[PDB]
Amino acid sequence: KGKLPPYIFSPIPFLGHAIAFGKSPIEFLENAYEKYGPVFSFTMVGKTFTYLLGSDAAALLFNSKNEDLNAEDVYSRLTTPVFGKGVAYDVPNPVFLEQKKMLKSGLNIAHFKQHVSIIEKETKEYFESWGESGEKNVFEALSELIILTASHCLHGKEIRSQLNEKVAQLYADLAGGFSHAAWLLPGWLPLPSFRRRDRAHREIKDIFYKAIQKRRQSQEKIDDILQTLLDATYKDGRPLTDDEVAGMLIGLLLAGQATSSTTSAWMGFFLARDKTLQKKCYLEQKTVCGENLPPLTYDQLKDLNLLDRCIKETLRLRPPIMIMMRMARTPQTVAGYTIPPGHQVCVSPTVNQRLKDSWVERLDFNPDRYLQDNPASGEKFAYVPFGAGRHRCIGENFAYVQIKTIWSTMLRLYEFDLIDGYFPTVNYTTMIHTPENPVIRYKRRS
Numbered sequence: 001k002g003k004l005p006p007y008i009f010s011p012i013p014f015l016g017h018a019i020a021f022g023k024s025p026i027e028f029l030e031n032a033y034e035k036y037g038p039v040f041s042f043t044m045v046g047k048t049f050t051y052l053l054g055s056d057a058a059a060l061l062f063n064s065k066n067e068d069l070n071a072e073d074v075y076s077r078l079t080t081p082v083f084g085k086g087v088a089y090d091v092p093n094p095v096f097l098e099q100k101k102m103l104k105s106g107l108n109i110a111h112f113k114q115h116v117s118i119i120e121k122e123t124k125e126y127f128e129s130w131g132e133s134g135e136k137n138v139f140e141a142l143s144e145l146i147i148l149t150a151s152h153c154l155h156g157k158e159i160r161s162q163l164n165e166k167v168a169q170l171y172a173d174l175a176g177g178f179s180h181a182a183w184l185l186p187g188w189l190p191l192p193s194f195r196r197r198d199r200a201h202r203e204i205k206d207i208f209y210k211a212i213q214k215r216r217q218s219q220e221k222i223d224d225i226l227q228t229l230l231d232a233t234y235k236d237g238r239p240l241t242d243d244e245v246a247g248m249l250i251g252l253l254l255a256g257q258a259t260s261s262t263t264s265a266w267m268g269f270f271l272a273r274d275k276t277l278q279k280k281c282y283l284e285q286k287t288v289c290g291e292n293l294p295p296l297t298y299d300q301l302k303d304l305n306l307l308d309r310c311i312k313e314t315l316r317l318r319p320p321i322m323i324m325m326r327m328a329r330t331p332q333t334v335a336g337y338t339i340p341p342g343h344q345v346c347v348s349p350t351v352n353q354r355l356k357d358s359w360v361e362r363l364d365f366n367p368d369r370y371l372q373d374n375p376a377s378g379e380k381f382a383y384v385p386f387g388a389g390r391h392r393c394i395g396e397n398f399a400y401v402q403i404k405t406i407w408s409t410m411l412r413l414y415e416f417d418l419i420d421g422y423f424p425t426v427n428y429t430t431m432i433h434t435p436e437n438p439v440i441r442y443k444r445r446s
């Protein structure tokens with residue numbers, strides 16, 4: 001009823017810990033865990049945040065209904081300037097639950113089977129630009145490549161043909177909107193997320209202005225996706241506006257690319273640092289697929305068990321979403337505490353996924369940790385890179401098909417090494433944590 005979580009004293013009124021948290025959020029929450037335990041409260045920018053660390057505490061957020069712990073209250077200020085009005089967190093959840101269902105229509109094994117060859121080809125094609133050896137920014141390459149692979153697979157060849165690698169800079173500017181400043185300040189700032197949204201909306205308006213330029217007397221008779229969004233209605237029978245179609249296409253491409261590009265880069269550096277692990281991943285390709293390395297198949301991906309655990313271990317140590325946030329609209333109880341309405345309630349996949357008391361060798365990249373007892377199978381919410389509950393991801397399978405096919409291809413193409421044994425440190429500029437100085441050394445494989 002009355003037992004508030006312990007509060008972290010700040011000697012600075014109103015601001016609170018906004019600077020220390022924003023600067024080193026993972027170190028901040030781990031230090032707070034040691035001192036205050038799994039549930040604690042602190043001020044940033046005149047607002048109270050309450051963090052739930054470890055499986056048991058995080059369960060409150062993951063088990064919660066949107067009416068009690070509300071996502072759009074927090075996320076709208078972050079996503080609405082990125083996607084546009086009327087989609088995702090700019091509408092009531094029930095409306096968004098209809099948009100989410102629509103974007104799920106192409107996410108099935110039927111489609112993923114087609115996806116494998118598209119991605120393998122785009123990867124083989126893109127990397128011909130890299131030659132026989134060299135030192136290149138693998139994060140800029142994967143950011144470019146995954147605009148092409150995500151759009152081709154999720155959006156289709158029509159939209160894919162209207163996009164190029166330059167769209168990667170637009171999507172890096174959109175992703176720049178996901179920051180501590182956007183999370184906590186009034187939305188009038190010097191940065192360029194705004195310029196990239198208008199440019200991207202324009203492209204998607206001209207792709208379906210072109211499809212809707214035909215949509216007037218045109219009845220297409222070919223298996224499509226893009227018709228899905230143009231041909232859909234809400235449960236009330238109402239069709240999508242051009243603005244709603246546009247915002248959902250921006251959003252699907254962001255979901256397909258922003259999450260996979262950082263994860264794919266990080267996995268590159270984990271594999272370059274562990275040469276023994278990398279040669280085992282390559283040898284696995286030949287063990288599963290054959291010495292001759294013929295075209296990749298969906299049914300092969302499921303048997304790349306070491307590469308699967310390497311992606312799992314990359315999402316453990318460098319998940320692209322480090323925090324998930326809700327507004328408490330109703331009193332909530334956890335670990336014997338009462339959270340009052342108006343608290344912002346957060347969980348951190350990054351903190352849960354390296355918690356000292358659950359994970360052995362917690363900072364080490366060890367894909368074999370999953371072949372014995374581990375908190376990913378042993379606990380409910382210690383490993384939650386794609387979330388859980390009512391706001392959980394719909395693209396986990398697609399993300400695995402995309403990263404596995406790209407890295408299957410890249411490991412067949414090349415051998416990768418660190419430059420001067422430099423391992424990229426974390427960039428906290430945005431809340432999608434990116435590798436600093438992500439220049440990789442490569443040479444032609446075998």
Ligand code: HEM
Pocket residue numbers: 071100154252255256257259260263319320321324325384385386387388390391392393394395396398399
């Ligand atoms: C490795 C890549 C990905 C990661 C790590 C990831 C992670 C996440 C996380 C953590 C959430 C939960 C957000 C929260 O609870 O506040 C989420 C939600 C979501 N993700 Fe993903 N995601 C990825 C790729 C994708 C892709 C490819 C799509 C679509 C094709 C997608 C669509 C969504 C959707 C629709 C939500 C639901 C938001 C809601 O219901 O409120 N994600 N994702």
Ligand SMILES: CC(C)=CCC[C@@H](C)[C@H]1CC[C@@]2(C)C3=C(CC[C@]12C)[C@@]1(C)CC[C@H](O)C(C)(C)[C@@H]1CC3
Pocket residue numbers: 075078079083087088099100103178247248249250251252254255321322323324325431432
């Ligand atoms: C426009 C439509 C329908 C989009 C569908 C996809 C969205 C729901 C996804 C794509 C990117 C996404 C994973 C994201 C997040 C959640 C769900 C999003 C918005 C959030 C807001 C979760 C909290 C994170 O701390 C952070 C702010 C970095 C991300 C940003 C991307």
